[PDB]
Design a protein around this ligand. Structure first.
Ligand SMILES: *[C@@H]1O[C@H](CO)[C@@H](O)[C@H](O)[C@H]1NC(C)=O
Ligand SMILES: *[C@@H]1O[C@H](CO)[C@@H](O)[C@H](O)[C@H]1NC(C)=O
Ligand SMILES: *[C@@H]1O[C@H](CO)[C@@H](O)[C@H](O)[C@H]1NC(C)=O
Ligand SMILES: *[C@@H]1O[C@H](CO)[C@@H](O)[C@H](O)[C@H]1NC(C)=O
Ligand SMILES: C[C@@H]1NC[C@@H](O)[C@H](O)[C@@H]1O
Ligand SMILES: C[C@@H]1NC[C@@H](O)[C@H](O)[C@@H]1O
Ligand SMILES: C[C@@H]1NC[C@@H](O)[C@H](O)[C@@H]1O
Ligand SMILES: C[C@@H]1NC[C@@H](O)[C@H](O)[C@@H]1O
Lengths: 431, 431, 431, 431
């Protein structure tokens, strides 16, 4: 039993599945996919800030007086096939999938009773997107996470609460908390990704009461995990795992379980129709970020943005499928792994360390020119063996009294290596 | 001071303006004007009942999966000019105008905080229709009435309350009562036309508390009037004036102030684009209904339906303008008048009686063939004079010992009478 | 046999049906009904002249860069029911119906091979409007007339011909003449209403050759009639009957058969959605114009504009049905009638004369105040009888040596005369 | 001077620029990009064949009765930036760009006088796409080619000609030939890519007369090249260069200059919105096809399909940019090269030969496992030198009396070779 207070809530141990997953897929999907321009913050940039570029876009592409709510019917999503999405996520090696049920626009991707005529069922897709995707993912043993934004930019009740200094709680009692309760009682989420919390304290959001109910009497109380975005000054301080800032890149090992969320599109989480090839993150960068995150004990959350028709564009599919291809070879060093005592060598070619049981894995992202890999951290005693996942046969290794360990990598012809951006060396009998 | 109970609320005397008005204009305007087919009950007939004709209409006119909320953006109302509306209503002789702020579809014609993205400001017209029309009417000294429907067909909270047997009040606390309070505190209505009450008791709707607040602390407490649609079994029993049933035609004088509401379109209150000329009420019928209603002490509420562009079609304009032309001649017998002791003759050519001070007015709708009007009710003593509003000179009259009074009407050439469907005889010095 | 020259073509006697008809209905229907604003000259006023009001309308109602061709798909005409149209035209007393097959916009209302993807079949209604209306009218013994505009405002071939001083005939050989031949060989028209001819001579338009072919080898050679709009300076000089100018009102009897075309809407031939009641021609004016036209030996062509959905608005229906109601009483003086030797009295109350066999008809539009009608033209000898169509019994009449004839009209109560705007006196045995 | 006959026309020598180009970019862009489903043959599959899948797509995505012409306004192309297109084509190494001016749908991408209201200027983009792209490409010294389809599926004049057995030429005189003349006299094309010719003989299409005019009096007579699609049985027999069949892969060296046209999308030339990653041609396949085509003396024409908004999707950009990256290293073996005397080794690892002056280039697509490349065709005499484009320093080579030549390739670490799918060896002093 837990009580509605942060010292009690923070003592809950994390379910082991989240740590063992190490790789999830983030989906940003909503009405913002209809303009598909600028970012998922289109409504705020256009109306809340009045940026001239967004006003020009609306002037040139839509009749005068066009409002953001008019985007609703245009969110047709007539090519959405959740089974294909789930198959792609499985082929990408993803262990969990986090879908945005509601973003700052306030448009819920499920039939919310408190979001009437502003949900995916009443207008637009005329479907329960959250339920369909959840069914498809549960059929393939993939964990489900629901992204919920606490705030809404232009909701009148939230604006009224903000005008009152958040001394009233009309918005929380009307929309936010009922939506969270409905999202938990149905679709039975494994993960809750909270957002939109930087404007108000946790007392206003009623976060402690909801978290106590979730941990005590919710149907998912046993194996649910939540992030740290539950109010002002709550990041990296309160919650299940720490998301900290977006695209978080710690320099050392954090003392709490964390997760780095990053987007394949460098300038938007939602889909952009005019996205250039340069805006797309390179695959070597994605694999390097995954390796560095997993080596430092964190989870990796890669984001894609579907189109308004419910399709994942071929470039995102290529990136995800190449991630999955690399994982199909180097997953023994990633899934259900733990950070080692070093996790990266000081003077090296960017070698990163993971551990699993008695096995140590050194992932290097740059083939040495001399053809010999230098590992000055490991200590070999009697029965050290080298594997080099994907290549058969134990490699040759030599010890040095002043230097460390030198391993002769197997020279291979071009376009003949199982991986192309990173390689894993497996050492057994190494302390 | 009044208390939240019907015996206390029913004791409030009616403000005299409503009785002195005797003629108002009803406006049914909303999202149902976009399909403009069948009636304003389009959503219920299509989805709540599944009538094959409405399903066929939606199949033939819209893409598959089209929902009622998608009609929202199409409610452009780009030709709405409230000043022209107010000028037409003034030229029609209307003393008050009742506009539907929200109908059973739940779409509010003003920026309701509890109807986010389902109101005339967020979607569709992108305007506050109620406020603009109110400003235009207040500039011309025309009283304003707000029509509010208590129920909504497909609102999830109302459906939940109905499922619980109306033992919960989620819908009332969330949408209905806040909307009524906002409609009263802004736009300062002179009339409240309640509707959508036949499914629930007044206790569920919180009608007594709202009416007590309206009569005690509202800004319009002094001169506001309400109808009788405040719950189950409330018609003709509770409220300011009695609307009773739609198109109410009493046979005798009612003991409570009442109002007959009727529509120029015989088959719909909302606008229909395929309305035939036969569906349009004849002008003689409209004037006859007005005369019979005013003679029986009731008010007359004539309804028009604007198009989705905010225009009043020429046929409705012609009907209203001919009503106003007749009133410009015969308004001395209508405005600020009272029912007489007879109000209609038993054996006549449909003569109806009104009174004002010491003057009696006999409105006849059929010119007698003999050219002599027979009035067996009035009693002349010494100084009886006949006026015949619109015609100069006192007419000749004769008394009979067994019969009543015979008045020689002024014979006139065709297309030369001020009125064409009804004529008024004014008698002074008549008991 | 006729030859391609005006002296030969003008000698063709008119088929008697056109003279015996005396009343037709004009239909202006096309892509211009989609904007339904300003007039049917919307495209020219907007793009060919650049009037600021039309540019403002397009700015406020459509996205930037919207072109006139984009109006094409919006011409849905999904409520078009030609049988209802034909029934209304029959109930209006119309003997022939002239529909615009193609206007200056160049959009053909039939599947024209030379107007690909710019016709009612390929885009918009997806129907052959001309064929459907023709079938409906032929089922009810109503004559069919096809309105064809020779010019098109923005057709590139016509603009090229105009640039060359009309010394080339690319437009005529490509579009105009093939369209006329297709319109004649199919739908077998009884009338051809030519238009759009004021910019070019008849030699450019190839009018003489087409008319010779029509009179010699066309399927309708026996009973086809054409108007006078076949080139520059051709009005009132060349053609079957003379339309002269639009809304032609001769002061005396013309020496050639003519036709007055007028529109119920005073400011447009096409439909206008914001048309006011004042813009609608009064019914007394319509009946007066018909009487004056028929008395002067001309035909009367009343125009209506259907909406983009294919509906005739209730006000146009009311005007047409009241015309038909008046005709149902006074058609003996109109249909198959001839102008008399006087046709109107010099000093009267606007009495107009028609003749049929030995019967003379005096239509008066103003009931005399004295109750006696003065007819100073007719001469009675021995067996003169008075009928007063719609009223039973011969009226009383008296002759004067210095004055003319005095007829005692039957005094009637208000709202009891068969007609309300004009009355007909029938005199037999009158020279 | 040339005469309108194939023996005279086929004797015209090809301008040297086309042979020296060796790589062009094909653009399929039109109204078919609006449905973006199935292929660019959407109209024929839907209406000309009635395939159930296309009918189902139209049923589910558009209102009933939707026609192909209604797609016209939806072709907005509001993100089309020809300068970005030209920059991408330059960065892809393309020497010429062929854009579809008109496809079988009959929709012209320029303001055609004979395609009124069915062209990119009157409807849809409201632009001259051909002119804008031509200006952008001419600014960057890239040759321009216009793709013109002779036939149109549903044009009434073409259907009439087909019904008559092509004994009439209404379609050719009305649309096809004027469009070709306008396309030549404006935009001054360097290449003409004819299509849609398999149904009619060249006599019907007037191909010989047009080609004689093009070679004699056209503004581009000096340096224009045409393909072989000018009538029935004209492929590989008549015309400038031979396209033969689509995706032509000869097994031996052809005796006439040819060109292989292939599409990055394996199942469509036009853009498909639901195209899968598997449907996208792999980059190694593209480079292999280019190498095999250039080695056999042909040109390579790679096709992309822009979206209806005028954007090139990131996957097509990635494929083109990687082609350009490979060309930036291996263009000395491709541009302005000639087929050698062998062009491929019988027993090898798929080595292909090109020649330029005294230099021979051997492109191999598979790194040998032994690390030694075997070239049994070349003969070294005294001064043979090896270059290996992209790698500095002459490689070591050895001759054999019974075998051929063995070259020791420079062993390199993974992800360190300038190219990744093919490598070029340059031999000088080799006969
Ligand atoms: C906060 O939570 C408590 C208990 O869960 C509840 O009683 C209260 O109504 C909630 N307040 C709001 C504003 O949601
Ligand atoms: C009913 O009215 C009372 C007093 O006006 C208020 O306290 C109560 O909350 C209301 N109930 C609902 C369901 O609106
Ligand atoms: C004019 O008519 C003649 C004969 O009908 C025909 O030969 C000629 O081609 C026509 N010219 C045009 C421009 O239509
Ligand atoms: C074919 O070309 C010749 C000469 O170029 C021309 O006279 C003739 O009209 C053309 N025919 C067609 C059908 O285009
Ligand atoms: C994941 C990111 N968190 C912050 C929010 O503002 C962004 O839109 C993304 O959702
Ligand atoms: C005035 C009428 N009252 C009942 C309601 O159901 C109708 O739609 C009208 O509003
Ligand atoms: C009948 C009228 N003739 C002239 C034309 O310009 C108008 O549009 C009408 O068609
Ligand atoms: C290039 C190809 N040639 C044949 C045509 O049918 C296809 O659509 C493509 O244009």
């Amino acid at each position: 039993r837990y009580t509605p207070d942060w010292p009690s809530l923070d003592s809950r141990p994390l379910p082991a599945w989240f740590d063992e997953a190490k790789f999830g897929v983030f989906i940003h999907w909503g009405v913002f996919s209809v303009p598909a321009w600028g970012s998922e913050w289109f409504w705020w940039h256009w109306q809340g800030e009045g940026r001239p570029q967004y006003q020009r876009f609306m002037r040139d592409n839509y009749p005068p007086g066009f409002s953001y709510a008019d985007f609703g019917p245009q969110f047709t999503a007539r090519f959405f096939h959740p089974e294909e999405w789930a198959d792609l996520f499985q082929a990408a090696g993803a262990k969990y999938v986090v879908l945005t049920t509601k973003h700052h626009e306030g448009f819920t991707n499920w039939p919310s009773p408190v979001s009437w005529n502003w949900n995916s069922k009443d207008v637009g897709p005329h479907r329960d997107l959250v339920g369909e995707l959840g069914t498809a993912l549960r059929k393939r043993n993939i964990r489900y996470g629901l992204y919920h934004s606490l705030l809404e930019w232009f909701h009148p009740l939230y604006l009224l609460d903000k005008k009152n200094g958040f001394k009233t709680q009309h918005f929380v009692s009307a929309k936010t908390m009922p939506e969270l309760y409905d999202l938990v009682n149905s679709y039975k989420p494994d993960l809750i990704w909270s957002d939109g919390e930087w404007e108000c304290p946790d007392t206003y959001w009623n976060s402690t009461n909801f978290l106590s109910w979730l941990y005590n009497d919710s149907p998912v109380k046993d194996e649910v995990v939540v992030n740290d975005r539950w109010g002002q000054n709550c990041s990296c301080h309160h919650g299940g795992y720490y998301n900290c800032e977006d695209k978080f890149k710690p320099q050392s090992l954090p003392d709490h379980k964390w997760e780095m969320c990053t987007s394949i599109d460098k300038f938007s989480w939602g889909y952009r129709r005019d996205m250039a090839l340069s805006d797309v993150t390179e695959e070597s960068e994605i694999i390097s970020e995954l390796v560095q995150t997993v080596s430092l004990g964190g989870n990796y959350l890669l984001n894609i943005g579907p189109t308004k028709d419910g399709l994942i564009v071929p470039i995102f599919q290529e990136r995800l499928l190449a991630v999955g291809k690399w994982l199909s070879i180097n997953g023994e060093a990633i899934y259900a792994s733990k950070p080692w005592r070093v996790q990266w060598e000081k003077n090296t070619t960017s070698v990163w360390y993971t551990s699993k049981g008695s096995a140590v894995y050194a992932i290097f992202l740059h083939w040495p020119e001399n053809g010999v890999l230098n590992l000055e951290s490991p200590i070999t005693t009697s029965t050290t063996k080298i594997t080099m996942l994907g290549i058969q046969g134990d490699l040759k290794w030599s010890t040095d009294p002043d230097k460390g360990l030198f391993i002769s990598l197997p020279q291979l012809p071009p376009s003949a290596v199982p991986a192309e951006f990173a390689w894993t060396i497996k050492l057994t009998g190494v302390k």
